[PDB]
Tab-separated table of C-alpha atoms and ligand atoms in Angstrom:
chain	number	residue	atom	x	y	z
A	15	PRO	CA	-5.639	-38.308	15.077
A	16	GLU	CA	-2.767	-38.028	11.604
A	17	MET	CA	-0.090	-35.605	11.732
A	18	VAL	CA	1.655	-33.712	8.696
A	19	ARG	CA	5.251	-31.731	9.920
A	20	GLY	CA	4.753	-32.832	13.060
A	21	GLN	CA	1.303	-31.008	13.381
A	22	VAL	CA	-1.607	-32.905	14.198
A	23	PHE	CA	-4.051	-32.634	11.644
A	24	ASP	CA	-7.286	-33.410	13.733
A	25	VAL	CA	-9.733	-34.447	10.974
A	26	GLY	CA	-10.907	-37.603	10.981
A	27	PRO	CA	-12.581	-40.270	10.666
A	28	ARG	CA	-14.379	-37.991	7.521
A	29	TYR	CA	-10.918	-36.831	6.425
A	30	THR	CA	-8.166	-38.712	5.811
A	31	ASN	CA	-4.659	-39.697	3.793
A	32	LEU	CA	-3.655	-36.008	4.771
A	33	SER	CA	-0.898	-34.506	2.501
A	34	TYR	CA	1.175	-30.904	2.889
A	35	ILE	CA	0.158	-28.512	0.627
A	36	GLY	CA	1.400	-25.350	1.247
A	37	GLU	CA	1.253	-22.875	4.286
A	38	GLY	CA	0.727	-18.485	4.705
A	39	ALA	CA	1.299	-16.583	7.445
A	40	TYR	CA	-1.350	-18.159	9.732
A	41	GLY	CA	-2.571	-21.119	8.527
A	42	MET	CA	-1.304	-24.960	7.490
A	43	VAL	CA	-2.851	-26.248	4.313
A	44	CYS	CA	-3.448	-30.313	3.471
A	45	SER	CA	-5.139	-32.160	0.939
A	46	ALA	CA	-7.323	-34.707	1.786
A	47	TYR	CA	-9.663	-37.357	1.153
A	48	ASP	CA	-13.582	-36.853	2.138
A	49	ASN	CA	-14.423	-40.293	3.126
A	50	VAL	CA	-18.132	-39.150	3.424
A	51	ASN	CA	-18.236	-37.301	-0.122
A	52	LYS	CA	-15.951	-39.842	-1.907
A	53	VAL	CA	-14.069	-36.192	-3.312
A	54	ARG	CA	-10.329	-34.464	-2.596
A	55	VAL	CA	-10.083	-31.233	-0.473
A	56	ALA	CA	-8.086	-29.085	0.277
A	57	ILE	CA	-8.095	-28.152	4.873
A	58	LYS	CA	-6.249	-25.461	6.239
A	59	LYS	CA	-5.941	-25.095	10.045
A	60	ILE	CA	-5.852	-22.311	12.045
A	61	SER	CA	-5.370	-21.865	15.737
A	62	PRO	CA	-6.015	-17.851	16.206
A	63	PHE	CA	-7.784	-17.269	19.639
A	64	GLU	CA	-4.671	-15.751	21.159
A	65	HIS	CA	-4.880	-13.181	19.043
A	66	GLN	CA	-7.751	-10.310	18.790
A	67	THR	CA	-6.436	-10.026	14.528
A	68	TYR	CA	-5.740	-13.823	13.925
A	69	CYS	CA	-9.335	-13.829	15.430
A	70	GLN	CA	-11.114	-11.487	13.435
A	71	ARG	CA	-9.525	-12.593	10.660
A	72	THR	CA	-11.164	-15.850	10.845
A	73	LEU	CA	-14.390	-14.938	11.721
A	74	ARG	CA	-14.600	-12.858	8.906
A	75	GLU	CA	-13.033	-15.574	6.162
A	76	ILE	CA	-15.803	-18.030	7.728
A	77	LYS	CA	-18.862	-15.629	7.597
A	78	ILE	CA	-18.155	-13.702	4.046
A	79	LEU	CA	-17.536	-17.345	2.298
A	80	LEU	CA	-19.981	-19.049	3.567
A	81	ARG	CA	-22.261	-16.596	2.383
A	82	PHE	CA	-20.560	-16.228	-1.486
A	83	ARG	CA	-21.139	-18.670	-4.171
A	84	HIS	CA	-19.804	-18.148	-7.353
A	85	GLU	CA	-17.008	-20.168	-10.189
A	86	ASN	CA	-14.418	-17.509	-9.703
A	87	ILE	CA	-14.172	-17.332	-5.294
A	88	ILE	CA	-13.342	-20.252	-3.291
A	89	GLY	CA	-16.078	-21.903	-1.435
A	90	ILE	CA	-15.896	-23.463	1.870
A	91	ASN	CA	-17.261	-27.129	2.312
A	92	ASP	CA	-17.271	-28.394	5.777
A	93	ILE	CA	-15.387	-26.700	8.865
A	94	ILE	CA	-14.534	-28.628	11.766
A	95	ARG	CA	-14.019	-27.922	15.889
A	96	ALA	CA	-14.201	-28.776	18.767
A	97	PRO	CA	-17.651	-29.837	20.364
A	98	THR	CA	-16.710	-26.983	23.195
A	99	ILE	CA	-15.420	-24.142	23.081
A	100	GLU	CA	-13.123	-25.004	26.270
A	101	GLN	CA	-11.904	-27.577	23.776
A	102	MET	CA	-11.495	-25.099	20.758
A	103	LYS	CA	-7.738	-24.731	20.225
A	104	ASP	CA	-7.516	-24.992	16.567
A	105	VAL	CA	-9.862	-24.941	13.801
A	106	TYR	CA	-9.721	-26.794	10.343
A	107	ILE	CA	-11.497	-25.153	7.402
A	108	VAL	CA	-12.101	-27.627	4.332
A	109	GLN	CA	-12.765	-25.801	1.075
A	110	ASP	CA	-12.639	-27.877	-2.732
A	111	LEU	CA	-8.934	-28.983	-3.776
A	112	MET	CA	-7.418	-26.802	-6.001
A	113	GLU	CA	-4.156	-27.922	-7.738
A	114	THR	CA	-1.366	-24.764	-6.802
A	115	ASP	CA	-1.796	-20.835	-6.781
A	116	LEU	CA	-0.314	-18.221	-9.156
A	117	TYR	CA	2.773	-17.368	-6.772
A	118	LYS	CA	3.970	-20.367	-7.322
A	119	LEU	CA	2.963	-21.032	-10.797
A	120	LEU	CA	5.357	-18.021	-11.994
A	121	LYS	CA	8.178	-19.050	-10.270
A	122	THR	CA	8.224	-21.967	-12.547
A	123	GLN	CA	6.970	-21.077	-15.588
A	124	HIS	CA	6.301	-17.866	-18.907
A	125	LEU	CA	2.560	-17.527	-18.978
A	126	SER	CA	1.797	-16.577	-22.708
A	127	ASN	CA	-0.396	-13.275	-23.781
A	128	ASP	CA	-3.841	-15.547	-24.230
A	129	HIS	CA	-3.144	-17.618	-20.957
A	130	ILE	CA	-2.477	-13.933	-19.345
A	131	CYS	CA	-5.848	-12.600	-20.500
A	132	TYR	CA	-7.499	-15.559	-19.246
A	133	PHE	CA	-6.471	-15.266	-15.543
A	134	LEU	CA	-6.783	-11.301	-15.519
A	135	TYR	CA	-10.213	-11.947	-17.317
A	136	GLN	CA	-11.326	-14.827	-14.208
A	137	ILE	CA	-9.623	-12.709	-12.062
A	138	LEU	CA	-11.860	-9.619	-12.568
A	139	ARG	CA	-15.269	-12.104	-12.615
A	140	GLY	CA	-14.590	-12.891	-9.397
A	141	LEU	CA	-13.779	-9.190	-8.225
A	142	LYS	CA	-17.119	-8.232	-9.461
A	143	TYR	CA	-19.021	-10.348	-7.892
A	144	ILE	CA	-16.754	-9.527	-4.765
A	145	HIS	CA	-17.970	-5.881	-5.346
A	146	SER	CA	-21.214	-6.230	-6.186
A	147	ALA	CA	-21.953	-7.616	-2.798
A	148	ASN	CA	-20.142	-4.029	-1.619
A	149	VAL	CA	-16.810	-6.510	-0.551
A	150	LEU	CA	-13.177	-5.093	-0.186
A	151	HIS	CA	-10.817	-8.216	-0.375
A	152	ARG	CA	-7.935	-5.947	0.796
A	153	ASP	CA	-5.542	-8.400	0.244
A	154	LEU	CA	-5.229	-9.942	-3.389
A	155	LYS	CA	-2.003	-11.104	-4.543
A	156	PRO	CA	-0.327	-13.837	-6.159
A	157	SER	CA	-0.683	-16.707	-3.635
A	158	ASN	CA	-4.352	-16.390	-3.184
A	159	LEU	CA	-5.141	-16.615	-6.082
A	160	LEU	CA	-5.449	-20.448	-7.047
A	161	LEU	CA	-5.406	-22.583	-10.065
A	162	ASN	CA	-6.813	-26.158	-10.968
A	163	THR	CA	-5.708	-28.837	-13.332
A	164	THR	CA	-8.140	-27.022	-15.894
A	165	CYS	CA	-6.719	-23.559	-15.403
A	166	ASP	CA	-9.532	-22.518	-13.794
A	167	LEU	CA	-8.915	-19.782	-11.395
A	168	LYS	CA	-10.183	-18.601	-7.607
A	169	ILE	CA	-9.438	-16.519	-5.072
A	170	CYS	CA	-9.344	-16.947	-1.521
A	171	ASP	CA	-8.103	-15.748	1.745
A	172	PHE	CA	-11.114	-13.536	2.782
A	173	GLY	CA	-9.337	-12.885	6.030
A	174	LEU	CA	-9.083	-9.192	5.951
A	175	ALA	CA	-11.997	-8.391	4.034
A	176	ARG	CA	-14.315	-5.936	4.926
A	177	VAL	CA	-17.473	-4.452	3.516
A	178	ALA	CA	-17.195	-0.993	1.408
A	179	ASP	CA	-17.964	2.549	3.739
A	180	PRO	CA	-15.248	4.560	2.873
A	181	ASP	CA	-17.472	7.918	5.147
A	182	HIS	CA	-18.835	5.449	7.651
A	183	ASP	CA	-15.586	3.582	8.463
A	184	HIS	CA	-13.013	4.486	11.354
A	185	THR	CA	-10.850	1.015	11.379
A	186	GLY	CA	-7.765	2.647	10.581
A	187	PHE	CA	-5.074	1.310	8.929
A	188	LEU	CA	-4.433	-2.789	8.381
A	189	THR	CA	-3.684	-4.508	11.751
A	190	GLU	CA	-1.799	-7.000	9.394
A	191	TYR	CA	1.472	-7.416	10.134
A	192	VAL	CA	2.986	-10.406	7.984
A	193	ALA	CA	2.378	-10.542	4.870
A	194	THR	CA	3.462	-8.799	1.670
A	195	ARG	CA	3.038	-5.253	1.305
A	196	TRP	CA	3.896	-5.004	-2.635
A	197	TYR	CA	0.707	-5.363	-3.614
A	198	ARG	CA	-1.025	-2.916	-1.440
A	199	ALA	CA	-2.585	0.449	-3.234
A	200	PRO	CA	-0.693	3.997	-2.440
A	201	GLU	CA	-3.342	4.948	-0.122
A	202	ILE	CA	-3.192	1.957	1.797
A	203	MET	CA	0.078	3.170	2.820
A	204	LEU	CA	-0.789	6.963	3.275
A	205	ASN	CA	-4.155	7.446	4.748
A	206	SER	CA	-6.074	5.406	8.025
A	207	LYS	CA	-9.798	5.926	6.405
A	208	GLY	CA	-11.435	6.087	3.133
A	209	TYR	CA	-10.827	2.928	1.282
A	210	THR	CA	-12.776	2.113	-1.609
A	211	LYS	CA	-13.555	-0.582	-4.294
A	212	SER	CA	-10.122	1.152	-5.416
A	213	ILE	CA	-7.751	-0.734	-3.739
A	214	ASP	CA	-8.439	-4.011	-4.998
A	215	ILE	CA	-7.935	-3.115	-8.976
A	216	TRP	CA	-4.412	-1.374	-7.939
A	217	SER	CA	-3.657	-5.160	-6.216
A	218	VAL	CA	-4.892	-6.692	-9.605
A	219	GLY	CA	-2.874	-3.600	-11.650
A	220	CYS	CA	0.152	-5.180	-9.604
A	221	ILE	CA	-0.634	-9.027	-10.536
A	222	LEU	CA	-0.946	-7.823	-14.145
A	223	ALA	CA	2.348	-6.182	-14.140
A	224	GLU	CA	3.526	-9.759	-12.986
A	225	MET	CA	2.578	-11.766	-15.510
A	226	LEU	CA	4.004	-10.241	-17.299
A	227	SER	CA	7.654	-10.199	-16.596
A	228	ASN	CA	7.599	-12.892	-13.957
A	229	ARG	CA	8.428	-10.345	-11.379
A	230	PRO	CA	7.116	-7.951	-9.018
A	231	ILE	CA	6.908	-4.471	-10.107
A	232	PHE	CA	7.210	-2.595	-6.610
A	233	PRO	CA	9.241	-4.924	-4.388
A	234	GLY	CA	9.512	-2.827	-1.772
A	235	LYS	CA	12.048	-3.412	1.367
A	236	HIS	CA	10.239	-1.605	3.601
A	237	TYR	CA	7.760	1.188	4.160
A	238	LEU	CA	8.876	4.553	2.463
A	239	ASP	CA	10.974	2.132	0.261
A	240	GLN	CA	7.829	0.820	-1.025
A	241	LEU	CA	6.330	4.454	-1.694
A	242	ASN	CA	9.882	5.076	-4.071
A	243	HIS	CA	9.122	1.930	-5.624
A	244	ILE	CA	5.764	3.305	-6.811
A	245	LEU	CA	6.353	6.765	-7.541
A	246	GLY	CA	10.095	5.837	-9.550
A	247	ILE	CA	7.476	4.395	-12.405
A	248	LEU	CA	4.572	6.693	-11.738
A	249	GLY	CA	6.216	9.714	-11.285
A	250	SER	CA	6.080	12.128	-8.682
A	251	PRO	CA	1.851	12.571	-7.832
A	252	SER	CA	0.458	15.579	-10.092
A	253	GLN	CA	-1.139	18.307	-7.576
A	254	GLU	CA	-4.533	16.917	-7.953
A	255	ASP	CA	-3.199	13.366	-7.074
A	256	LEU	CA	-1.406	15.048	-3.903
A	257	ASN	CA	-5.634	16.071	-2.455
A	258	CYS	CA	-5.954	12.039	-2.328
A	259	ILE	CA	-4.090	12.177	0.469
A	260	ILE	CA	-5.980	13.566	3.563
A	261	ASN	CA	-3.213	12.937	5.927
A	262	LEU	CA	-1.740	16.434	5.272
A	263	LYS	CA	1.524	14.771	7.093
A	264	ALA	CA	1.833	12.119	4.504
A	265	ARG	CA	0.844	14.397	1.615
A	266	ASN	CA	3.477	17.125	2.918
A	267	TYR	CA	5.984	13.531	3.221
A	268	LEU	CA	4.998	13.309	-0.789
A	269	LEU	CA	5.573	17.013	-1.367
A	270	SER	CA	9.315	16.820	0.357
A	271	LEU	CA	10.257	13.841	-1.959
A	272	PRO	CA	12.912	14.890	-5.122
A	273	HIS	CA	11.343	14.456	-8.443
A	274	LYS	CA	10.798	12.088	-10.226
A	275	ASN	CA	9.687	10.939	-13.657
A	276	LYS	CA	7.378	9.222	-15.222
A	277	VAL	CA	9.032	5.322	-16.463
A	278	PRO	CA	6.361	4.602	-20.059
A	279	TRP	CA	5.118	1.038	-19.752
A	280	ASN	CA	6.555	-0.053	-22.540
A	281	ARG	CA	10.279	0.426	-20.916
A	282	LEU	CA	9.274	-1.610	-18.632
A	283	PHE	CA	7.442	-4.222	-20.853
A	284	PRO	CA	8.507	-4.018	-24.354
A	285	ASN	CA	6.859	-7.036	-25.664
A	286	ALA	CA	3.991	-6.358	-24.146
A	287	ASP	CA	0.654	-6.207	-26.188
A	288	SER	CA	-0.504	-2.491	-26.323
A	289	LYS	CA	-3.846	-3.784	-24.809
A	290	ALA	CA	-2.593	-4.765	-21.654
A	291	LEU	CA	-0.427	-2.176	-20.998
A	292	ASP	CA	-3.435	0.243	-21.870
A	293	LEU	CA	-5.211	-1.571	-19.348
A	294	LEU	CA	-2.474	-1.609	-16.628
A	295	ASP	CA	-2.288	1.900	-17.104
A	296	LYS	CA	-5.825	2.345	-15.916
A	297	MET	CA	-5.242	0.904	-13.131
A	298	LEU	CA	-2.066	1.439	-11.459
A	299	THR	CA	-3.216	5.162	-11.676
A	300	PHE	CA	-2.719	7.141	-8.126
A	301	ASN	CA	-5.557	8.395	-7.673
A	302	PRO	CA	-8.261	6.148	-6.508
A	303	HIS	CA	-10.802	8.259	-7.967
A	304	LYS	CA	-9.166	7.924	-11.268
A	305	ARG	CA	-8.631	4.214	-11.083
A	306	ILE	CA	-11.058	2.038	-13.274
A	307	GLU	CA	-13.457	0.089	-11.769
A	308	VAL	CA	-14.099	-4.055	-12.033
A	309	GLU	CA	-16.839	-3.231	-14.791
A	310	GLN	CA	-15.132	-1.248	-17.216
A	311	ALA	CA	-11.596	-3.148	-16.639
A	312	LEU	CA	-13.885	-6.159	-17.883
A	313	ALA	CA	-15.165	-4.454	-20.690
A	314	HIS	CA	-11.560	-3.212	-21.574
A	315	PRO	CA	-10.401	-4.031	-25.382
A	316	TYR	CA	-8.136	-6.769	-23.711
A	317	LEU	CA	-10.047	-8.851	-22.768
A	318	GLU	CA	-13.000	-8.648	-25.561
A	319	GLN	CA	-13.011	-12.835	-26.246
A	320	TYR	CA	-13.936	-12.880	-23.015
A	321	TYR	CA	-16.014	-10.172	-21.598
A	322	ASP	CA	-20.104	-11.545	-21.351
A	323	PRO	CA	-22.024	-9.610	-18.700
A	324	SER	CA	-24.621	-12.504	-19.285
A	325	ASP	CA	-22.224	-14.871	-18.055
A	326	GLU	CA	-20.647	-12.899	-15.158
A	327	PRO	CA	-22.789	-12.954	-12.082
A	328	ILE	CA	-23.007	-10.614	-9.123
A	329	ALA	CA	-24.772	-11.069	-5.594
A	330	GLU	CA	-28.511	-10.113	-5.114
A	331	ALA	CA	-28.170	-8.302	-2.345
A	332	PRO	CA	-24.400	-6.686	-0.464
A	333	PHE	CA	-23.206	-8.307	2.550
A	334	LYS	CA	-23.412	-7.092	5.938
A	335	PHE	CA	-21.177	-8.339	8.908
A	336	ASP	CA	-24.366	-7.407	12.032
A	337	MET	CA	-21.675	-6.050	13.753
A	338	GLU	CA	-18.511	-3.974	14.062
A	339	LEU	CA	-15.856	-6.467	15.577
A	340	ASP	CA	-12.157	-3.816	15.208
A	341	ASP	CA	-13.098	-3.747	19.081
A	342	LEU	CA	-14.206	-7.094	19.969
A	343	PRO	CA	-11.901	-8.956	22.479
A	344	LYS	CA	-10.574	-12.271	21.660
A	345	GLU	CA	-12.739	-13.613	23.868
A	346	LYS	CA	-15.960	-12.088	22.287
A	347	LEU	CA	-14.665	-13.141	19.085
A	348	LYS	CA	-14.094	-17.167	19.816
A	349	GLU	CA	-17.670	-17.254	21.148
A	350	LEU	CA	-18.796	-15.992	17.387
A	351	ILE	CA	-16.580	-18.229	15.891
A	352	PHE	CA	-17.669	-21.212	18.401
A	353	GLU	CA	-21.557	-19.666	17.043
A	354	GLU	CA	-20.815	-19.343	13.304
A	355	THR	CA	-19.267	-23.215	13.437
A	356	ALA	CA	-22.142	-24.516	14.848
A	357	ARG	CA	-23.887	-25.308	11.938
A	358	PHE	CA	-20.670	-27.335	10.936
A	359	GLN	CA	-21.939	-29.946	14.198
A	360	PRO	CA	-24.499	-32.630	14.521
A	361	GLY	CA	-27.425	-31.709	16.156
A	362	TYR	CA	-27.263	-27.395	15.173
B	401	ANP	N1	-7.744	-24.921	-1.504
B	401	ANP	C1	-6.736	-24.620	-1.282
B	401	ANP	N2	-6.728	-25.641	-2.318
B	401	ANP	C2	-5.256	-25.419	-2.825
B	401	ANP	N3	-4.559	-24.300	-2.083
B	401	ANP	C3	-4.391	-23.980	-1.310
B	401	ANP	C4	-5.780	-23.765	-0.776
B	401	ANP	N4	-6.315	-23.575	-0.228
B	401	ANP	C5	-4.933	-22.804	0.442
B	401	ANP	N5	-4.377	-22.636	-0.244
B	401	ANP	C6	-2.698	-22.904	-0.130
B	401	ANP	O1	-1.791	-22.655	0.750
B	401	ANP	C7	-1.312	-20.999	1.126
B	401	ANP	C8	-2.055	-20.383	2.342
B	401	ANP	O2	-3.310	-20.028	2.109
B	401	ANP	P1	-4.069	-18.924	3.043
B	401	ANP	O3	-5.842	-18.634	2.635
B	401	ANP	O4	-3.660	-17.906	1.972
B	401	ANP	O5	-3.341	-18.905	4.466
B	401	ANP	P2	-3.563	-17.948	5.601
B	401	ANP	O6	-2.151	-18.375	6.335
B	401	ANP	O7	-4.487	-18.257	6.057
B	401	ANP	N6	-3.312	-16.339	4.976
B	401	ANP	P3	-1.726	-15.871	4.098
B	401	ANP	O8	-0.349	-15.147	4.677
B	401	ANP	O9	-2.671	-14.620	3.711
B	401	ANP	O10	-1.671	-16.702	2.930
B	401	ANP	C9	-1.996	-20.494	-0.513
B	401	ANP	O11	-1.150	-19.458	-0.426
B	401	ANP	C10	-1.887	-21.712	-1.153
B	401	ANP	O12	-0.936	-22.129	-2.137
B	402	EAI	C1	-3.743	-23.266	-16.989
B	402	EAI	C2	-2.753	-23.506	-16.722
B	402	EAI	C3	-2.643	-24.271	-15.357
B	402	EAI	O1	-3.634	-23.258	-14.457
B	402	EAI	O2	-1.951	-25.447	-14.534
B	402	EAI	C4	-2.999	-25.688	-13.442
B	402	EAI	C5	-1.430	-25.987	-13.288
B	402	EAI	C6	-0.398	-25.828	-12.633
B	402	EAI	C7	0.705	-26.349	-12.474
B	402	EAI	C8	0.741	-27.396	-11.295
B	402	EAI	C9	-0.332	-28.263	-11.219
B	402	EAI	C10	-1.381	-26.939	-11.925
B	402	EAI	C11	-0.785	-22.920	-17.026
B	402	EAI	O3	-0.512	-22.243	-15.933
B	402	EAI	C12	-0.755	-22.926	-18.360
B	402	EAI	C13	-2.167	-22.125	-18.866
B	402	EAI	C14	-3.171	-22.708	-18.925
B	402	EAI	C15	-4.513	-21.767	-19.420
B	402	EAI	C16	-3.064	-23.836	-20.121
B	402	EAI	O4	-2.761	-24.930	-19.514
B	402	EAI	O5	-3.910	-23.534	-20.943
B	402	EAI	C17	-2.849	-25.172	-21.863
């Protein structure tokens, strides 16, 4: 099997000429050539089976991405794994090949307002579809916004996604422990229940702020410091803001902090388009019930030159998992992953 940086990529003979792209906390990603379809692809290797939470990520990403079909969402082309469950230790997810991601892009170039506007449009267009399927992405960040040579944008990295169900979701706090928290809505860090589509709009607002200055807006060093970063710009929450915090402990914590004044957006972004700052303001609102929704964001004057509901597709029906996975042991999740990937095996 071909080796990349001392790592086995057992994807031949169909896929060859592997080249390292990058990696996340869980997957190593290579470009490759598909000799069957005569096209370039990306391949993500993950090795999840010793960790329940990693198994959850892998099963969610596979199930959701195979059901979604949208220009601004990465598709799964193929999945490689061993022919028996006992031999299966790695999973290779084959996707269309993108050229870079927005994290990498922002480290080497400043974006013009036209570029920012177009990228934000594509993010919200993809998000409109995700939310129309009643799915929460829950982990949007610059590194999982992929870009290609023609400057098309696709959202990837769905291992934290969940069906939106604030009234009946007793999953609790996020069980993701490695990746960044700079884009997490304040209610994600304060409450263990009741997450809505507004958590993704918060993330997009953080991404917009970062496109405007090439610096993350809330780069907290740890849990309480993240909160202080948010409050140091939005100012102390109002009385109505405080009611969204269901955990009276967390709310009394916030009440105990020293008062902080709001920082006007045009002090942070003095040269930015005022329409961009107006939309940003509506995306980064502490109260999730007051935060702008994805269709309202698309219809905002900042995006006027792109907004077109005739060309912004939605899902036919809301996505459903057919089972709750949070309490299944990893050995059961391994069976479900084996079953979910059998459709890519000969003789299914
Ligand atoms: N289809 C793709 N084409 C090109 N680059 C890709 C593609 N998928 C992923 N990448 C790159 O690989 C990186 C890791 O992918 P990702 O799916 O986020 O991995 P992960 O380890 O499963 N989760 P995370 O820790 O959140 O990044 C991305 O941030 C991109 O730079
Ligand atoms: C698109 C362009 C882009 O998306 O680049 C893709 C890429 C960057 C780096 C390495 C490999 C691929 C930009 O980043 C600038 C804005 C776009 C719209 C452009 O090029 O317009 C002229």
